[PDB]
Design a protein. Structure first.
Lengths: 217, 217
């Protein structure tokens, strides 16, 4: 129904202050003092941070405040922290059938910019994996920031053409991102190339990790 | 703000009925007749589908029913259609701090192809990494559908709370999902235990894989 438009996304640095608008009308936003803001970290249960346009639960950080001017309501966050990076929604009582209409969501990106190196870990294939006859060197990269890195492989000092499958990066609990890289292989092929390696390029930086095929040699 | 426990995921074939559950206390769910449900297509504005336990907003499909008994409430979607796939949340009015409490949500995945049990591959810490005075294990979950699983780690029949980091499952070419998880251990811990295990749950069925200290297959 009458969906309240919100900015698709705002971004700010720590300690700064963002504010999110909830476009509306006389029938909803500017019709009653019944707007609410919710904070949602995908995967978790939404939190009710704002209700009745300006109220705030006796437990929600006072860095969060709301209000409206005409047919527009808006949440404003002060002293951006880490937790703050989530999705924000506004909802409101309306004058029609619908008991309450919701905003379309605003994703707040709290940078922080505390840049960190991609501690990379290269794994050799596994024993069990050898049975059905499979082999895979898994390169683990974590605790890095920003969540932007490009990985490559050096198959025996030579970047031989192969099949590398760099996963869809994800954000960990510690905020820092963590990705990985896989280079599936074959029997005699992993025995042939004397030593495989991983190469994580993190913002004008590059760390290597080599793993040699073996059995306690 | 003690979230309303909900089922992480649910699946149903086109045309079937499904019931999602919301569990609370007499202080909120069993204290009022103010339980709401919302359908939400990620990246979209949440929609109010059920309210006051069973009330339904006009224009909303009578395929969506709500009911409650005791301190548990539950939504039911009958005659499933592909377009019904979305996240469903349930909320209730509270007596304490915050007035309204929410549930963790539930991804309703309507089956569109046969179910797919995952492939789990565990990895022992690389000796290379062991000399760096650090150990980390990796568990690979792949080839599964629907795209939802839970990963638990074990240290000799003993649950490993801290030190874990699982990733969100991502869809792949074959339209099945993959995902990973890694546990960070000091080298001591590693050799300190008989073995470690990776428990992977998918649609009820759980599989495990074990790996023991020092060896070269």
């Amino acid at each position: 129904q009458s969906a309240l438009p919100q900015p698709a996304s705002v971004s700010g640095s720590p300690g700064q202050s963002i504010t999110i608008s909830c476009t509306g009308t006389s029938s909803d936003v500017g019709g009653y003092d019944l707007v609410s803001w919710y904070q949602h970290h995908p995967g978790g249960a939404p939190k009710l941070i704002i209700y009745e346009v300006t109220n705030r639960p006796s437990g929600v950080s006072d860095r969060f405040s709301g209000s409206k001017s005409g047919n527009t309501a808006s949440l404003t966050i002060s002293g951006l922290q880490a937790e703050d990076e989530a999705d924000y929604y506004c909802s409101s009582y309306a004058s029609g059938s619908t008991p309450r209409i919701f905003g379309g969501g605003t994703r707040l990106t709290v940078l922080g910019q505390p840049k960190a190196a991609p501690s990379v870990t290269l794994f050799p294939p596994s024993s069990e994996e050898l049975q059905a006859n499979k082999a895979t060197l898994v390169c683990l990269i974590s605790d890095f920031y920003p969540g932007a890195v490009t990985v490559a492989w050096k198959a025996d000092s030579s970047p031989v053409k192969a099949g590398v499958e760099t996963t869809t990066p994800s954000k960990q609990s510690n905020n820092k991102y963590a990705a990985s890289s896989y280079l599936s292989l074959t029997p005699e092929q992993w025995k042939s190339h004397r030593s495989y390696s991983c190469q994580v390029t993190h913002e004008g930086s590059t760390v290597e990790k080599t793993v040699a095929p073996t059995e306690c040699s």
